[PDB]
Structure formats: C-alpha cells, structure tokens
Design a protein around this ligand. Sequence first.
Ligand code: HEM
Ligand code: HEM
Ligand code: HEM
Ligand code: HEM
Ligand SMILES: *Cc1ccc([C@@H]2CCCCO2)o1
Ligand SMILES: *Cc1ccc([C@@H]2CCCCO2)o1
Lengths: 141, 141, 146, 146
Amino acid sequence: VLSPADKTNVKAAWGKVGAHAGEYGAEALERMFLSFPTTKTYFPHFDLSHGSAQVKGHGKKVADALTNAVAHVDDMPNALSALSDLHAHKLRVDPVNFKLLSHCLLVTLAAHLPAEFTPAVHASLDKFLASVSTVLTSKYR
Amino acid sequence: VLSPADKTNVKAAWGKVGAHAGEYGAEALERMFLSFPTTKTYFPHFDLSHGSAQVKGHGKKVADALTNAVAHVDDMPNALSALSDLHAHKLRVDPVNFKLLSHCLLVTLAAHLPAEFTPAVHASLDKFLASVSTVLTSKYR
Amino acid sequence: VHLTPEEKSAVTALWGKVNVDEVGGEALGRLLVVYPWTQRFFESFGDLSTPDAVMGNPKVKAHGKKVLGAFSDGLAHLDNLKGTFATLSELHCDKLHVDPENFRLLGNVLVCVLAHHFGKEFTPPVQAAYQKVVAGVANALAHKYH
Amino acid sequence: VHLTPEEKSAVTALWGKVNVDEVGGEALGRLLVVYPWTQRFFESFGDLSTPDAVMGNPKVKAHGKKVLGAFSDGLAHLDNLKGTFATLSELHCDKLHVDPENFRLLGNVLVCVLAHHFGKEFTPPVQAAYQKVVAGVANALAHKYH
Ligand code: HEM
Ligand code: HEM
Ligand code: HEM
Ligand code: HEM
Ligand SMILES: *Cc1ccc([C@@H]2CCCCO2)o1
Ligand SMILES: *Cc1ccc([C@@H]2CCCCO2)o1
C-alpha cells in the first residue's frame, strides 16, 4: 500500500525519465532477457537480439504504461484493466517474472538517475512496481 | 485485486464462521506455531502451550479483525490502519509469516467447513488473505 | 527429509487412508484454479477456462494421479527424498523451468486438500508432520536448482 | 557458477574499483530500508528508526563491510561456493533462521548499489554476470536448508 510519500517519491523519480522512456524501458527488458533467460519464453515470436527494433519499441510501451500507472496511482485496477487482461487472463505470466522485471527497472533507474535513487525513493519505487505487478497478475473481472 | 465474485465468495464463506471465530482463529494460530515454530518468536512473552487461554483470546482478536476486513473489503487500508501500525511499523513482521498464517487459516476453514471450501471459494479466500497480509505488512503513513 | 520418529508414524498412518485415485487430481486441479498462471504449463490438457472445467478435466485427474504416486514414493522413502525425486527434479527444473515457489504452493494445496477430506482428523500435529513432508518434497524437486 | 572468461574479466575489473568502505554498508542499509522486517535481525545495531539513521549507522557500515568481504571471498572461489560459505550458512540458517528469500533480496540490493555507483559502466551484460554470482552466493548461503 502506497503512502502519500510513496506516491510523491514515485512521481518525482519516474518524472525524470521524460524522453528517455523508450531507452530506459528497452534497457530494462534487455537486462531482464540477458540476466534471466527464462523470461524470454514469453516472447517466442519476438526478435530478442540486442538492439532489436522490436525490443526497443516494446520497451517504449512498457515505460509509457508505467507513466500511466504513476498518473493513476490511486485507481490502478481501473486504469490497468486492459493490461491485467493481457498478462493475467491471456498470457498467464508467472508472478516471479514480474519480480525480475521490477528488479531490472530498479537497476536501470539506479544506473541512469543516481541522484533520484535514494534509499527512501528506492523503497517507494519497489512498492510501486510490486503494486503494478499485483494488478497485472490478478484476475479481478 | 478482488473481483466481485471474490468479494461475494469471501463474504459468504466467512459469514458461515459466525460464533466459531475465536475457535477457528485460535486453531489457526496453534497450527502455525506447531507447523512453523519460528513464528513463535514474534510472541516471546506469550503462553503458547496447547489450549492456553492467551492463544484463545488472541485467536478471537485475529478472527474479529478478519471479520472487520470482510466488512470493509473495499476500504481495507483505512479499516486496518491500526493493525498496519502494529505489524509493519512496530513488529516488522516478515511477510513470509503472513503466508504461513494465511495457509493455516485456509487449513482450518477446510477442516471445519467442507461444503463451503470449494475450489472457487478456496481461490477467493486465498486472494483475500493475501490482500489483508499486504495491508498489514505495508507502512502507508 | 527429516521427520521425528513420531512424525513419520503420523504421516504413514494418515496416508494409508488417502484415496490415491482422487486426492492428486483434486490437488492439481486446485493448484490450477487458485494459482492460475500454473495453467500455462498444461496447454495440451484442454479446457481449463473455469473451476468446473478444471476440476472435471480428465487429463487433470489422470495427471494428478501420477503426482500423487510420486508423493507416495516420497512417503515410502522419507529419509531419501533427494534421490526419490532426482529424475523429476531434472524434468521440472532443467526441462520445464518451473519456478520452485510453485512446488511449495502445490505442497500447501495438497495440505489443504488433506484438511478438506479429513476434517478434525487432520489435527495440528498431523498437519505439522505433513508440512515437513511437502517442504521436503519441494526442496527435493528443486535440487537441480541448488 | 560458470562465468565465461569474458564475464569473469568484466566482473573482476568492476569489482576491483568497488569502494570497500561504503558499498557493503549501502547494500545492507538499503536492505533494511526497502525490506524493513530485516531490521528485526539487527536489534543491537542501535538507531534504525529512519532511512538516514540506517544508512549513517556505523554498525551498519561496519557490518556491510563484512558482507562485501563475504562476496569478495565468493568471487575468489566461484568453483566452491558451498565450501567457502559452509560456516556462514550454518550461522544464517540453523542459528539466525533467515528466510532464504532474504538472501536473494540482499544479493539483488547489492546489484542495485553497483548500478548506482558505476552508472553506465554497469551494462546489461555486466549485470547478467553479477546476477549469476549473487544467485550462486544466495544458494550457497541457503545450503544448510537444502
Ligand atoms: C511492470 C510490469 C509490466 C508492465 C508495465 C508491462 C506492460 C506491458 C505493455 C504496455 C504491453 C503492450 C500491450 C499492448 O499495447 O498491446 C505488454 C505486453 C506483453 N508483456 Fe508486459 N508488462 C509488464 C510485465 C511483464 C512481464 C514480467 C512479462 C514476462 C516476463 C511480460 C510479458 C509480456 C508479453 C509476452 C507481452 C506481449 C508482447 C506482444 O506479443 O506484443 N510482461 N506489457
Ligand atoms: C491475517 C493475518 C493477521 C491478522 C488479521 C492479525 C491481526 C492481529 C490483531 C487483531 C492483533 C491484536 C491487536 C491489538 O491487540 O491491538 C494482532 C497482534 C499481533 N500479531 Fe497479528 N495478525 C495477522 C498476522 C500476523 C502474523 C503472521 C504474525 C507473526 C508471525 C503476527 C504477529 C502479531 C503479534 C506479535 C501481535 C502482538 C501480540 C501481543 O504482543 O500482544 N500477526 N494481530
Ligand atoms: C511439488 C510436487 C510435484 C510433484 C511430486 C510432481 C510430480 C510430477 C510427475 C510424477 C510428473 C510425471 C512425469 C513423467 O511421467 O515423466 C510430472 C509432470 C509434470 N509436472 Fe509436476 N510435480 C510437482 C510440481 C509441479 C508444479 C508446481 C508444476 C507447475 C506449476 C508442474 C508441472 C508439470 C508438468 C508441466 C509436467 C508434464 C505434464 C505433461 O505431461 O505435459 N509440476 N510432475
Ligand atoms: C545473502 C548474502 C549474505 C551474506 C554474504 C552475508 C554475510 C554475513 C557475514 C560475513 C556475517 C558475519 C559473520 C560473523 O561475524 O561470524 C553475517 C552476519 C549476520 N547476518 Fe548476514 N549475510 C547475508 C544475508 C543475510 C540476511 C539476508 C540477513 C537478514 C535479513 C542476515 C542477518 C545476519 C545477522 C543477524 C548477522 C549477525 C550480526 C551480528 O553480529 O549481530 N544475513 N552475514
Ligand atoms: C502496497 C500495495 C501492494 C499492492 C497494492 C495495491 C494492489 C492493487 C492496486 C492498488 O495497490 O498496494
Ligand atoms: C489482489 C490484491 C492484492 C492486494 C490487494 C489490495 C491490497 C490493498 C487494498 C485491498 O486489496 O489486492
């Protein structure tokens, strides 16, 4: 459960992504695919080579979804319903993979935004990503 | 995230607990302490002997809180604020222990209410107890 | 993979009354229902789209029977769980890439099913003995991850 | 764990630049901040009441330095992590009863701290190499459970 401080920490730190949305999201996926090869089995139809255009464009959709979640942090089940239908109903992604991608998003933020990634902000971003992960893996309609 | 069917299932099954709340609460605590003895260290000054009046009284506190959570299934962070204060801020309970007690509550319910403990209701009760555990282990002020 | 002498006697006595034809399918079915991502590992099994479809699926019942046979094999060799499950560990870890948390989940689903069938007979001491069994099975199935 | 010779060189190069006075205390500190229940294992460390207090706590910094030294020792013995960590595993499992999921959390917090310190030098391939190390260490620390 996000505190009022959690929400303002996430808004400040994620707001620094800006035009780097596709870059950072792509990098987070690339980190995930290289570090945890089993995650690749959800993307068999993808070109997953490095610098793949498909991975980069997908990285942008991931980032933009997170931006939308930051903006709807108080009604994420409502705002993320389409993504829950995809990841929970249709893809049946094992929740462990959401922990792996969440970790890789934190690593990417730490590597690019060292001034933002303080210990309290690290804790809020972790809870935020856990909350997004819970919505996308629950069948609630 | 709880679906409407989840809320319907939880309310109907927990409704059947009724006057047995303290009894089932105490049973679930004793199943936890015996099955997972490390959980006893959160209660260093308790009488945890079998049938102890203290565990009886505590099980009643647990069960009543769950009844309260069932009544506020759409308002659980507000409703459970004081319990989050206790379990997350002060006691700092490791979330693995909430999984253990949640499993022992399901075991207790299945042992006592077989007709009610259908696969769908089992699934809904699991999500509900996961939701309760999330609230109680998060610092959201 | 180490119960007390008394815990072994308790698990053995209870398991003699377990319906070997039903409990496995019930446990596998509830796994697929309660933890729905696990359905992804069973694409070929047919209709898994509703609880009733899962629990009534003959391929689910049949496979659950094989699962429960493997638990029986472990219960007959409680001090050598690693060796009893070594081949299944290769299958589940090297080949299928099942995350070991799912082993723990199925173990606890089985405990719920035992509780469901036996009621008050599934006492807290009996449960605690079985928690050691299913933890040991899950650890053994995960041995190729270790 | 098996690093390629390319991965081994990249890991070793980066680890040689690690500030051994700070990196370990930052990883342990972040563990206690991001996963507050882990503070229950450190009652005698004094003030853990706020993030600034945790990170600046001299007992946290000193103990984090020991942690980092355990990772350095693992790095120097990738071919026998179980032997290198047998004493520590006995300590963490049989005595402290640390849940093994927390071993993995700390390893990944360490990864975040390396990312934080080295920025773009902590490339995805460098991270993948380090993920093999921390998983190896976490597994070795958990061995006495297995
Ligand atoms: C923070 C967590 C996540 C977010 C915000 C997220 C967001 C998204 C978005 C926005 C899409 C595109 C939907 C569309 O526009 O049609 C998508 C698709 C997809 N996601 Fe994720 N996702 C997350 C976690 C995961 C994880 C952990 C996995 C598996 C390891 C995964 C597997 C997939 C797959 C396979 C697709 C479909 C790709 C395709 O065929 O087009 N997702 N996700
Ligand atoms: C469904 C999950 C849980 C519920 C509903 C719950 C509810 C409660 C309630 C109502 C109280 C009494 C509060 C008061 O007297 O003001 C309490 C106290 C307490 N709980 Fe829980 N709790 C849960 C999980 C856990 C777990 C898993 C642990 C540890 C393994 C735990 C450890 C404690 C402790 C140490 C106390 C204080 C006992 C004392 O010293 O008086 N709780 N909880
Ligand atoms: C934890 C206790 C478990 C036991 C004792 C067990 C036992 C078994 C057994 C005996 C087989 C048949 C192997 C053969 O005949 O060659 C099997 C196959 C299989 N298991 Fe499990 N298993 C367990 C957990 C799991 C879990 C948690 C999952 C996934 C969530 C899983 C996924 C599978 C799959 C996909 C197969 C192959 C099914 C097929 O024929 O397509 N297992 N398991
Ligand atoms: C996963 C990698 C870990 C490594 C490499 C590691 C390393 C170490 C080392 C070198 C020591 C000192 C041993 C001694 O002084 O004899 C130690 C002690 C300790 N560790 Fe860890 N540790 C890890 C995980 C954890 C975790 C996750 C926790 C708890 C959440 C924990 C709790 C403790 C405690 C309580 C002590 C004793 C501190 C004291 O002296 O009071 N450890 N660890
Ligand atoms: C702290 C926390 C974990 C999960 C959540 C919920 C999930 C459902 C949507 C809103 O946040 O909060
Ligand atoms: C499915 C799910 C996990 C946690 C939740 C939230 C927690 C906070 C408020 C009530 O449900 O839902």
